[PDB]
Amino acid sequence: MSTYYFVIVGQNDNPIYEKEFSTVNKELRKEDHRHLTQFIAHAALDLVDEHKWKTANMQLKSIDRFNQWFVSAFITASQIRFIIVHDNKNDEGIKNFFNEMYDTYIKNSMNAFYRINTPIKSPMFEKKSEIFGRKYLLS
Amino acid sequence: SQSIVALLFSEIVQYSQSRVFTVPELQTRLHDLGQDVGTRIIDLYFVRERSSKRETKLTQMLLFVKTTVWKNLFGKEAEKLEHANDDERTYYIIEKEPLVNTFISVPKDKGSLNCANFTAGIVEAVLTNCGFPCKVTAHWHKGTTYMVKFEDFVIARDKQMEEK
Amino acid sequence: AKKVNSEFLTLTYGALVTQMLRDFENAEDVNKQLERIGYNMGMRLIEDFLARTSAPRCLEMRETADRIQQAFRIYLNIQPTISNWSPASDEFSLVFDSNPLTEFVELPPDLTNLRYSAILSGCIRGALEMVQLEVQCWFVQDQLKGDNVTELRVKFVRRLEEVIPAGED
Amino acid sequence: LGTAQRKTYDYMEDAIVCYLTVCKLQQFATRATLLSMECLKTARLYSEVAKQLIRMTNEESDLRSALLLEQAAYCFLVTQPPMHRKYAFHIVLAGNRYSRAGQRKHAYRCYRQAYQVFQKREW
């Protein structure tokens, strides 16, 4: 199968949120995935910042490929760093998946109570993300 | 209405003028409100009205974000743009229309600065969220005018990518 | 023409609400504060709605009711719908499907005791008091609380403006 | 001499990492990568040394693998910001690698390095 990992990064490099869909097993190793990739999102970011200074493309499909960890970047106008990291490729899912992530993010970013670079606990957003994952990633 | 927004904004200014003691911190509070506006409008208009595609380069983003923000705020782009050689950090964005005068303005004795700073606050929000930390001053020179002090790392960064 | 975008007014209202939540810790205070600012709104909203149209003063309640619904459809560009009269016809209910102020904002669950769009109730109050007319208005249902659409009450307890424009003052 | 030919630099990797795919002469491959790192460090491609030190880390051993990870860490960070906290993240793994066999001095100092940029980037 494919592994599933989403991350949300504030402008101030704050990891706002992270979402998972992989078949549940060895939860300690899934947390290892989390920090592995959250700290991979570190050089990925130190890289993708100049990459975004190069191209203002819709979405930076590939930033690094660790030969088992894959870096896909959809950076926002507010520079919100977004990365999907997976052991397997699925480009068509990920492109418009980051699209729909961005969309529901706009929806839940409008609310005045949110302030820049802040974790968002809205389980409505959780189920919106889950529906997207079942649409564009999971089967 | 026009006048409902003018009224709600008069209550803005008055709430500040209440729980704020002196003018410059009142302008600071206006600037905070402006940051609040920008913080979400910029992400909105990345897609719908900005060709859905990101733009990074300085002057293009300056002018185009100027225009798109003004179209979806008042539908009136800023009348001119000056970027000053004598200080490459010093750019001026100037709009003859003050957002303030929806209600025509304040006493002309106590507060030299006005909503002009609150609009400057929205400006600062969008710039710094695009990737352009900057400080903005509102001056009553040639009507409502502004001046932007970009970020040093940013100023070096684009000064370097002046070429490809 | 209104010459302005609905989202910009919504953002200014959100700026107010968030700033109140910050400056003052309690929902009750921030709500009473905003109700005061809306009271002071009404003192100019009602004179404006009169400058647009010199409506008749009052022969009956529902005349004031459709006057104010006209005004609501004026500045908010949204047609309200009066309903739910008293047996005594004195008090009615007012319906807004979606307030530019109320909408584009949902509420964090901590603020349930907050009544969000109460600025409008304040608006009605001050608007009726500068017109020397004594009424009580509170949102019996609000779009945010799970109500279908924002519902108000309009309790016109008594009168302060007489038939001759001399009045009591 | 000062010519620092990028041509010979790339050929050198063609006779090091690319020769590791051809024959199993990892001894001569690691010899080449060692001096290629120093000559590419004097040049400007410090990320090049780092990338082939990561391509030597997977093989190496335990103390050796951790040593190449520590070399890759500073090399990628020296050229430009790229790897400013992932270098720290991977010397935390290289830290326990040194502890298992990695030099105790190297372990503590690379751990201290990691903690320094961790505080710099707390988030």
Coordinates of C-alpha atoms in Angstrom, one line a residue:
Chain A
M1 CA 0.0 0.0 0.0
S2 CA 0.9 3.7 0.4
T3 CA 1.7 5.4 3.7
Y4 CA -0.2 8.6 4.5
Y5 CA 1.2 11.6 6.2
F6 CA 0.1 15.3 6.1
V7 CA 1.8 18.2 7.9
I8 CA 0.8 21.8 8.5
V9 CA 3.5 24.4 9.2
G10 CA 3.0 27.9 10.3
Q11 CA 5.0 30.8 8.9
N12 CA 7.1 30.8 12.1
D13 CA 7.8 27.2 11.3
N14 CA 5.3 26.0 13.8
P15 CA 4.0 22.5 13.1
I16 CA 0.3 23.4 13.2
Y17 CA -1.2 19.9 12.6
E18 CA -0.4 16.5 11.1
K19 CA -2.8 13.9 9.8
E20 CA -2.5 10.1 9.2
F21 CA -4.5 7.5 7.4
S22 CA -2.2 4.4 7.2
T23 CA -3.3 1.0 8.3
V24 CA -2.8 1.0 12.0
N25 CA 0.1 -1.1 13.3
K26 CA 3.3 -0.5 15.4
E27 CA 2.1 2.9 16.6
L28 CA 5.5 3.6 18.1
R29 CA 7.0 3.2 14.6
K30 CA 4.3 5.4 13.2
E31 CA 5.3 8.1 15.7
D32 CA 8.8 7.5 14.5
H33 CA 7.5 8.2 11.0
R34 CA 5.9 11.4 12.5
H35 CA 9.1 12.9 14.0
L36 CA 11.3 11.5 11.2
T37 CA 9.3 13.3 8.7
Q38 CA 8.5 16.4 10.9
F39 CA 12.3 16.8 11.2
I40 CA 12.6 15.9 7.5
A41 CA 10.2 18.7 6.9
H42 CA 13.0 20.8 8.4
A43 CA 15.6 20.4 5.7
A44 CA 12.7 20.0 3.2
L45 CA 11.7 23.5 4.4
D46 CA 15.3 24.9 4.3
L47 CA 15.3 23.6 0.8
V48 CA 11.8 24.4 -0.4
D49 CA 12.1 28.0 0.7
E50 CA 14.7 28.7 -2.0
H51 CA 12.8 26.4 -4.3
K52 CA 9.7 28.6 -3.9
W53 CA 11.9 31.6 -4.3
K54 CA 12.7 30.0 -7.7
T55 CA 9.2 29.0 -8.9
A56 CA 5.9 30.4 -7.8
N57 CA 4.2 27.3 -9.2
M58 CA 0.8 26.1 -8.0
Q59 CA 2.5 23.2 -6.1
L60 CA 6.0 21.9 -5.8
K61 CA 5.4 18.2 -6.4
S62 CA 8.9 17.1 -5.4
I63 CA 11.4 18.7 -3.1
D64 CA 13.4 15.8 -1.9
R65 CA 13.1 12.0 -2.5
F66 CA 14.9 10.2 0.3
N67 CA 14.6 7.0 -1.8
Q68 CA 12.0 5.9 0.7
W69 CA 10.6 9.2 2.0
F70 CA 9.0 11.5 -0.6
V71 CA 8.7 15.3 -0.2
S72 CA 5.7 16.9 -1.9
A73 CA 5.2 20.6 -1.3
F74 CA 2.1 22.9 -1.7
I75 CA 3.2 26.2 -0.2
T76 CA 0.5 28.9 0.3
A77 CA 0.3 32.6 -0.2
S78 CA 0.7 33.0 3.5
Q79 CA 3.8 30.7 3.1
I80 CA 2.1 27.9 5.0
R81 CA 4.4 25.0 4.4
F82 CA 2.5 21.8 3.5
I83 CA 4.1 18.5 2.9
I84 CA 2.8 15.0 2.2
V85 CA 5.4 12.3 2.9
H86 CA 4.8 8.8 1.7
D87 CA 6.7 5.6 0.9
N88 CA 4.8 5.4 -2.4
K89 CA 3.9 7.9 -5.2
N90 CA 0.4 8.9 -6.2
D91 CA 0.7 12.2 -8.0
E92 CA -2.9 12.6 -9.2
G93 CA -4.2 12.1 -5.7
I94 CA -1.7 14.4 -4.1
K95 CA -2.0 17.4 -6.5
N96 CA -5.7 18.1 -6.1
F97 CA -5.5 16.6 -2.6
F98 CA -3.2 19.5 -1.6
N99 CA -5.7 21.6 -3.6
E100 CA -8.6 20.5 -1.5
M101 CA -6.5 20.7 1.7
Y102 CA -5.9 24.3 0.7
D103 CA -9.5 24.9 0.1
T104 CA -10.9 23.6 3.4
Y105 CA -7.9 25.3 5.0
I106 CA -9.2 28.6 3.5
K107 CA -12.6 27.8 4.9
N108 CA -11.3 27.2 8.4
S109 CA -8.8 30.0 8.2
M110 CA -11.3 32.7 7.6
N111 CA -12.8 32.4 11.1
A112 CA -11.5 35.4 13.0
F113 CA -10.8 33.4 16.1
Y114 CA -7.9 31.7 14.3
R115 CA -4.7 33.7 14.4
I116 CA -1.6 33.2 12.2
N117 CA 0.4 30.1 13.0
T118 CA -2.0 28.4 15.4
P119 CA -3.1 24.8 15.8
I120 CA -6.7 24.2 14.8
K121 CA -8.6 21.5 16.7
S122 CA -11.9 21.6 14.7
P123 CA -12.9 18.0 14.3
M124 CA -15.1 19.2 11.4
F125 CA -11.7 19.9 9.7
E126 CA -10.7 16.4 10.7
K127 CA -13.6 14.8 9.0
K128 CA -13.2 17.1 6.0
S129 CA -9.5 15.9 5.8
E130 CA -10.6 12.3 6.2
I131 CA -13.2 12.5 3.4
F132 CA -10.5 14.0 1.2
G133 CA -8.1 11.2 2.1
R134 CA -10.7 8.6 1.3
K135 CA -11.3 10.5 -2.0
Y136 CA -7.8 11.3 -3.2
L137 CA -5.6 8.9 -1.3
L138 CA -7.3 6.0 0.4
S139 CA -9.5 3.3 -1.1
Chain B
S1 CA -24.3 50.3 2.8
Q2 CA -21.4 52.7 2.6
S3 CA -22.6 54.5 5.7
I4 CA -23.0 51.3 7.8
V5 CA -19.4 50.5 7.3
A6 CA -18.5 54.1 8.2
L7 CA -20.6 53.7 11.4
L8 CA -19.1 50.4 12.4
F9 CA -15.6 51.9 11.8
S10 CA -16.5 54.9 13.9
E11 CA -17.3 52.5 16.7
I12 CA -13.9 50.8 16.0
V13 CA -12.1 54.1 16.5
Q14 CA -14.2 55.0 19.6
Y15 CA -13.6 51.6 21.2
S16 CA -9.9 52.2 20.8
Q17 CA -10.3 55.8 22.0
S18 CA -11.9 54.4 25.1
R19 CA -9.7 51.6 26.3
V20 CA -6.6 53.2 24.8
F21 CA -4.9 56.2 26.5
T22 CA -2.7 57.9 23.9
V23 CA -2.8 58.3 20.2
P24 CA 0.3 56.3 19.0
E25 CA -0.8 53.2 20.8
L26 CA -4.3 53.7 19.3
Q27 CA -2.6 53.7 15.9
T28 CA -0.9 50.5 17.0
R29 CA -4.3 49.0 17.9
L30 CA -5.6 50.0 14.4
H31 CA -2.5 48.4 13.0
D32 CA -3.3 45.2 14.9
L33 CA -6.8 45.2 13.4
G34 CA -5.2 45.6 10.0
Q35 CA -2.9 42.6 10.6
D36 CA -6.0 40.7 11.5
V37 CA -7.7 41.5 8.2
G38 CA -4.7 40.7 6.1
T39 CA -3.9 37.5 7.9
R40 CA -6.9 35.8 6.2
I41 CA -7.7 37.9 3.1
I42 CA -4.4 37.1 1.5
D43 CA -4.9 33.4 1.7
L44 CA -8.5 33.8 0.4
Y45 CA -7.4 35.7 -2.7
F46 CA -4.5 33.5 -3.6
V47 CA -6.9 31.5 -5.6
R48 CA -10.1 33.3 -6.6
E49 CA -8.7 36.6 -7.9
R50 CA -4.9 36.1 -8.2
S51 CA -4.9 33.6 -11.1
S52 CA -5.0 30.8 -8.5
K53 CA -1.2 30.7 -9.0
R54 CA 1.4 31.9 -6.5
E55 CA 3.6 34.9 -7.3
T56 CA 6.8 35.5 -5.3
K57 CA 8.8 38.2 -7.0
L58 CA 8.7 41.6 -5.2
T59 CA 7.4 44.4 -7.4
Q60 CA 5.0 42.2 -9.4
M61 CA 3.5 40.9 -6.1
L62 CA 3.5 44.4 -4.7
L63 CA 1.5 45.9 -7.5
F64 CA -0.7 42.9 -8.3
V65 CA -1.6 42.2 -4.6
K66 CA -2.2 46.0 -4.2
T67 CA -4.7 45.8 -7.1
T68 CA -6.4 42.5 -6.2
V69 CA -6.8 43.5 -2.5
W70 CA -8.2 46.8 -3.5
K71 CA -10.6 45.3 -6.0
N72 CA -12.0 42.9 -3.4
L73 CA -11.9 45.5 -0.7
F74 CA -13.3 48.7 -2.3
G75 CA -13.0 47.8 -6.0
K76 CA -10.5 50.7 -6.5
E77 CA -6.8 50.1 -6.9
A78 CA -4.2 52.5 -5.5
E79 CA -3.7 55.4 -7.8
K80 CA 0.1 55.2 -8.0
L81 CA 3.2 53.4 -6.9
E82 CA 6.6 54.9 -6.1
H83 CA 9.7 52.9 -5.4
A84 CA 12.6 55.2 -4.4
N85 CA 16.2 54.7 -5.5
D86 CA 17.7 56.9 -2.7
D87 CA 16.7 54.1 -0.3
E88 CA 16.0 50.9 -2.1
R89 CA 14.2 49.8 1.0
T90 CA 12.0 52.9 0.7
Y91 CA 9.0 52.3 -1.5
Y92 CA 5.8 54.4 -1.3
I93 CA 2.3 53.1 -2.2
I94 CA -0.2 56.0 -2.3
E95 CA -3.9 56.0 -2.7
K96 CA -5.9 59.3 -2.8
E97 CA -8.9 57.5 -1.4
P98 CA -8.7 57.1 2.4
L99 CA -10.6 54.1 3.7
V100 CA -11.3 56.4 6.7
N101 CA -13.4 59.0 4.9
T102 CA -16.4 56.7 4.5
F103 CA -17.1 58.7 7.6
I104 CA -15.5 62.0 7.0
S105 CA -12.6 62.3 9.3
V106 CA -11.5 63.0 12.9
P107 CA -10.5 66.2 14.8
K108 CA -7.5 67.8 13.2
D109 CA -5.9 68.8 16.5
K110 CA -5.2 65.6 18.6
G111 CA -4.6 62.8 16.2
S112 CA -2.2 63.4 13.3
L113 CA -2.6 59.7 12.2
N114 CA -5.8 57.9 11.4
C115 CA -7.2 54.8 9.8
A116 CA -4.5 55.3 7.2
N117 CA -2.4 53.3 9.7
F118 CA -5.1 50.6 9.9
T119 CA -5.0 50.1 6.1
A120 CA -1.2 50.1 6.5
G121 CA -1.7 47.3 9.0
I122 CA -3.6 45.2 6.4
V123 CA -0.8 46.0 4.0
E124 CA 1.8 44.8 6.5
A125 CA -0.2 41.6 7.1
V126 CA -0.3 40.7 3.4
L127 CA 3.3 41.6 2.7
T128 CA 4.7 39.8 5.7
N129 CA 2.5 36.8 5.0
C130 CA 3.5 36.6 1.3
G131 CA 7.1 36.5 2.5
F132 CA 7.9 40.2 2.9
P133 CA 8.2 41.4 6.5
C134 CA 7.9 45.2 6.4
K135 CA 7.1 48.3 8.4
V136 CA 4.6 50.8 7.0
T137 CA 4.1 54.4 7.8
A138 CA 1.0 56.4 6.8
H139 CA 1.6 60.1 6.0
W140 CA -0.8 62.9 5.2
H141 CA 1.5 63.8 2.3
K142 CA -0.2 64.0 -1.1
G143 CA -3.3 62.6 0.4
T144 CA -3.3 59.2 2.1
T145 CA 0.2 57.9 1.3
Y146 CA 2.2 55.0 2.6
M147 CA 5.8 54.0 2.9
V148 CA 7.2 50.4 3.2
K149 CA 10.4 49.2 4.9
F150 CA 10.9 45.6 3.7
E151 CA 12.8 42.9 5.4
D152 CA 16.6 42.9 5.2
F153 CA 17.0 39.2 4.5
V154 CA 14.2 39.7 2.0
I155 CA 15.9 42.8 0.5
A156 CA 19.1 40.9 0.0
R157 CA 17.2 37.9 -1.3
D158 CA 15.5 39.7 -4.1
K159 CA 18.5 41.9 -4.8
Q160 CA 20.2 38.5 -5.4
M161 CA 17.4 37.1 -7.5
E162 CA 17.3 40.3 -9.6
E163 CA 18.8 37.9 -12.1
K164 CA 18.0 34.3 -12.9
Chain C
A1 CA -24.8 51.3 -4.1
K2 CA -23.1 50.5 -0.8
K3 CA -19.7 50.7 -2.7
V4 CA -18.2 48.0 -0.5
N5 CA -17.6 44.3 -0.2
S6 CA -19.5 42.1 2.3
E7 CA -16.4 40.3 3.4
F8 CA -14.6 43.5 4.4
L9 CA -17.4 44.4 6.8
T10 CA -17.3 40.8 8.1
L11 CA -13.6 41.1 8.7
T12 CA -14.0 44.4 10.6
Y13 CA -16.7 42.7 12.8
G14 CA -14.5 39.7 13.4
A15 CA -11.7 42.1 14.4
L16 CA -14.0 43.7 17.0
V17 CA -15.1 40.3 18.4
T18 CA -11.6 38.9 18.6
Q19 CA -10.2 42.1 20.1
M20 CA -12.9 42.0 22.8
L21 CA -12.2 38.4 23.6
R22 CA -8.6 39.5 24.1
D23 CA -8.9 42.8 25.9
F24 CA -11.7 41.5 28.2
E25 CA -11.7 38.0 29.5
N26 CA -15.4 37.4 29.9
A27 CA -18.1 37.0 27.2
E28 CA -20.7 38.8 29.3
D29 CA -18.6 42.0 29.4
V30 CA -17.6 41.9 25.8
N31 CA -21.2 41.3 24.9
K32 CA -22.5 44.1 27.0
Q33 CA -19.8 46.3 25.6
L34 CA -20.7 45.5 22.0
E35 CA -24.3 46.0 22.8
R36 CA -23.4 49.5 24.0
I37 CA -21.5 50.3 20.8
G38 CA -24.5 49.0 18.9
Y39 CA -26.8 51.2 21.0
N40 CA -24.6 54.0 19.9
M41 CA -24.8 52.7 16.3
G42 CA -28.5 53.0 16.3
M43 CA -28.5 56.7 17.2
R44 CA -27.1 57.2 13.7
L45 CA -28.5 54.3 11.9
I46 CA -32.1 55.4 12.6
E47 CA -31.4 59.0 11.5
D48 CA -29.8 57.7 8.3
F49 CA -32.7 55.4 7.5
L50 CA -34.9 58.5 8.0
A51 CA -32.7 60.6 5.7
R52 CA -33.1 57.9 3.0
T53 CA -36.8 57.9 3.6
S54 CA -39.0 60.0 5.9
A55 CA -41.1 57.1 7.0
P56 CA -44.3 57.7 9.0
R57 CA -43.7 57.8 12.8
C58 CA -46.0 55.2 14.1
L59 CA -49.7 54.2 13.8
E60 CA -49.1 50.6 14.5
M61 CA -46.3 48.2 15.4
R62 CA -46.0 46.3 12.2
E63 CA -45.6 49.7 10.4
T64 CA -42.4 50.2 12.4
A65 CA -41.6 46.5 11.8
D66 CA -41.6 46.7 8.1
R67 CA -39.8 50.1 8.3
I68 CA -37.0 48.4 10.1
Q69 CA -37.0 45.4 7.8
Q70 CA -36.7 47.9 5.0
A71 CA -33.7 49.4 6.7
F72 CA -32.2 46.0 7.3
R73 CA -32.6 45.2 3.6
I74 CA -31.0 48.6 2.9
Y75 CA -27.6 48.6 4.6
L76 CA -27.3 44.8 4.8
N77 CA -28.8 44.3 1.3
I78 CA -30.8 41.4 2.7
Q79 CA -34.5 41.2 2.9
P80 CA -35.7 40.3 6.3
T81 CA -39.1 38.7 7.1
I82 CA -41.2 39.8 10.0
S83 CA -43.2 37.1 11.8
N84 CA -44.4 35.8 15.2
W85 CA -46.7 38.6 16.4
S86 CA -48.1 39.0 19.9
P87 CA -51.8 38.3 20.4
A88 CA -51.6 42.0 21.3
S89 CA -49.6 42.7 18.1
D90 CA -47.2 44.7 20.2
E91 CA -44.1 42.4 19.7
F92 CA -42.9 40.6 16.7
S93 CA -39.9 38.5 15.5
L94 CA -37.3 39.4 12.9
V95 CA -35.6 37.0 10.5
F96 CA -32.1 37.2 8.9
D97 CA -31.1 34.2 6.8
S98 CA -27.4 35.1 6.8
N99 CA -25.8 38.2 8.3
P100 CA -22.6 39.4 6.6
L101 CA -21.6 40.2 10.1
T102 CA -22.8 36.9 11.5
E103 CA -21.7 34.8 8.6
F104 CA -18.1 34.0 7.4
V105 CA -17.6 33.3 11.1
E106 CA -18.3 30.3 13.3
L107 CA -17.6 30.1 17.0
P108 CA -15.1 28.2 19.2
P109 CA -17.0 26.0 21.6
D110 CA -15.7 27.8 24.7
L111 CA -17.9 30.9 23.8
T112 CA -21.3 29.4 24.0
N113 CA -22.5 31.9 26.6
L114 CA -21.4 34.6 24.1
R115 CA -24.2 36.1 22.1
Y116 CA -22.3 37.0 19.0
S117 CA -24.3 39.2 16.6
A118 CA -25.9 41.2 19.5
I119 CA -24.5 44.3 17.9
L120 CA -27.7 44.3 15.9
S121 CA -29.9 44.2 19.0
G122 CA -27.9 47.1 20.3
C123 CA -28.4 48.8 16.9
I124 CA -32.2 48.4 17.2
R125 CA -32.2 49.7 20.8
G126 CA -30.3 52.9 20.1
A127 CA -32.1 53.4 16.9
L128 CA -35.4 53.2 18.7
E129 CA -34.2 55.4 21.5
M130 CA -33.0 58.3 19.4
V131 CA -36.4 58.1 17.7
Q132 CA -37.8 58.3 21.3
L133 CA -39.4 54.9 21.1
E134 CA -39.1 52.3 23.9
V135 CA -38.5 48.7 22.8
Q136 CA -36.8 45.5 24.0
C137 CA -34.9 43.4 21.4
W138 CA -32.9 40.2 21.9
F139 CA -32.1 37.5 19.4
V140 CA -34.4 34.7 20.5
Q141 CA -32.6 32.5 17.9
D142 CA -29.1 33.1 16.4
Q143 CA -27.7 31.5 13.2
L144 CA -24.6 30.4 15.1
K145 CA -26.3 28.7 18.0
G146 CA -27.7 26.0 15.8
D147 CA -30.8 28.0 15.0
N148 CA -31.9 27.9 11.3
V149 CA -31.6 31.7 11.0
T150 CA -31.1 34.6 13.4
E151 CA -34.4 35.3 15.1
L152 CA -35.0 38.4 17.3
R153 CA -37.7 39.6 19.6
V154 CA -38.9 43.2 19.4
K155 CA -40.8 44.1 22.7
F156 CA -42.2 47.6 22.3
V157 CA -43.1 48.2 26.0
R158 CA -44.2 51.8 25.7
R159 CA -44.0 55.1 23.9
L160 CA -41.8 58.2 24.3
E161 CA -42.6 60.2 21.0
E162 CA -46.0 61.9 20.9
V163 CA -48.3 62.7 18.0
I164 CA -47.1 66.4 17.9
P165 CA -43.4 66.7 17.2
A166 CA -43.0 68.7 20.4
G167 CA -42.7 65.5 22.4
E168 CA -41.4 64.9 25.9
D169 CA -37.7 65.7 26.5
Chain D
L1 CA 47.2 24.4 -8.4
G2 CA 43.9 26.4 -8.0
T3 CA 42.3 25.2 -11.2
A4 CA 39.8 23.1 -9.1
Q5 CA 38.4 21.5 -12.3
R6 CA 34.7 20.6 -11.8
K7 CA 35.2 18.2 -14.7
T8 CA 37.8 16.1 -12.7
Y9 CA 35.6 16.5 -9.6
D10 CA 32.6 14.8 -11.3
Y11 CA 34.9 12.2 -13.0
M12 CA 36.2 11.4 -9.4
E13 CA 32.6 10.6 -8.3
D14 CA 32.3 8.5 -11.5
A15 CA 35.3 6.5 -10.1
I16 CA 33.9 6.4 -6.5
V17 CA 30.1 6.1 -5.9
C18 CA 29.5 5.0 -9.5
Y19 CA 32.4 2.5 -9.3
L20 CA 30.7 1.1 -6.1
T21 CA 27.8 0.1 -8.4
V22 CA 30.3 -1.6 -10.9
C23 CA 32.8 -3.5 -8.6
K24 CA 32.9 -4.1 -4.8
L25 CA 36.1 -2.0 -4.3
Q26 CA 34.6 0.1 -1.5
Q27 CA 38.1 0.6 -0.1
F28 CA 39.2 2.7 -3.2
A29 CA 35.7 4.3 -3.4
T30 CA 35.9 5.6 0.2
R31 CA 39.5 6.8 -0.4
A32 CA 38.3 8.8 -3.5
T33 CA 35.2 10.2 -1.6
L34 CA 37.4 11.2 1.4
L35 CA 39.7 13.6 -0.6
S36 CA 36.9 14.5 -3.0
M37 CA 35.0 15.9 0.1
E38 CA 38.0 18.1 1.1
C39 CA 38.6 19.4 -2.5
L40 CA 34.8 20.0 -3.0
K41 CA 34.7 21.8 0.4
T42 CA 37.5 24.2 -0.7
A43 CA 35.5 24.6 -4.0
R44 CA 31.9 25.6 -3.2
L45 CA 30.0 22.2 -3.6
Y46 CA 29.9 21.2 0.2
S47 CA 26.4 19.7 -0.4
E48 CA 28.1 17.4 -3.0
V49 CA 30.4 16.0 -0.3
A50 CA 27.4 15.7 2.1
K51 CA 25.2 13.8 -0.5
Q52 CA 28.0 11.2 -1.2
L53 CA 28.7 10.9 2.5
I54 CA 25.0 10.0 3.0
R55 CA 25.5 7.5 0.0
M56 CA 28.4 6.2 2.1
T57 CA 26.5 6.2 5.4
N58 CA 24.0 3.5 4.3
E59 CA 27.0 1.1 3.7
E60 CA 29.9 2.0 6.1
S61 CA 29.4 0.2 9.4
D62 CA 28.3 1.7 12.8
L63 CA 31.1 4.0 14.0
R64 CA 32.0 4.7 10.4
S65 CA 28.4 5.3 9.3
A66 CA 27.9 7.8 12.1
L67 CA 31.2 9.5 11.2
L68 CA 30.0 10.0 7.6
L69 CA 26.6 11.2 8.8
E70 CA 28.4 13.8 11.0
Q71 CA 30.5 14.9 8.0
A72 CA 27.3 15.1 5.8
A73 CA 25.7 17.2 8.6
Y74 CA 28.2 20.1 8.7
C75 CA 28.9 19.9 5.0
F76 CA 25.3 20.5 3.9
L77 CA 24.8 23.3 6.5
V78 CA 28.0 25.1 5.6
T79 CA 27.1 25.9 2.0
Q80 CA 23.6 27.4 2.7
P81 CA 20.7 27.1 5.2
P82 CA 19.6 23.7 3.5
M83 CA 19.8 21.1 6.4
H84 CA 19.7 23.4 9.4
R85 CA 17.7 21.0 11.7
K86 CA 17.5 17.8 9.7
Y87 CA 21.4 17.7 10.0
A88 CA 20.7 18.0 13.7
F89 CA 17.9 15.3 13.5
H90 CA 20.3 12.8 11.7
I91 CA 23.2 13.4 14.2
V92 CA 20.8 12.4 16.9
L93 CA 20.6 9.0 15.1
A94 CA 24.4 9.2 14.5
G95 CA 24.7 10.1 18.2
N96 CA 23.3 6.7 19.3
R97 CA 25.2 5.1 16.4
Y98 CA 28.4 6.5 17.9
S99 CA 27.2 5.4 21.4
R100 CA 26.7 1.8 20.2
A101 CA 30.2 2.0 18.4
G102 CA 30.4 5.8 17.6
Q103 CA 33.2 7.6 19.6
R104 CA 31.7 8.7 23.0
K105 CA 33.4 12.2 22.5
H106 CA 31.9 12.4 18.9
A107 CA 28.5 11.2 20.3
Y108 CA 28.2 13.9 23.0
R109 CA 29.5 16.8 20.8
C110 CA 27.2 15.9 17.8
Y111 CA 24.3 15.6 20.4
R112 CA 25.3 19.0 21.8
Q113 CA 25.4 20.4 18.2
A114 CA 21.9 18.9 17.5
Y115 CA 20.5 20.5 20.8
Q116 CA 22.0 23.9 19.8
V117 CA 20.0 24.2 16.5
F118 CA 17.0 22.5 18.2
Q119 CA 16.8 25.5 20.6
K120 CA 17.4 27.8 17.6
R121 CA 14.4 26.0 15.8
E122 CA 12.3 24.9 18.9
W123 CA 9.1 24.4 16.8

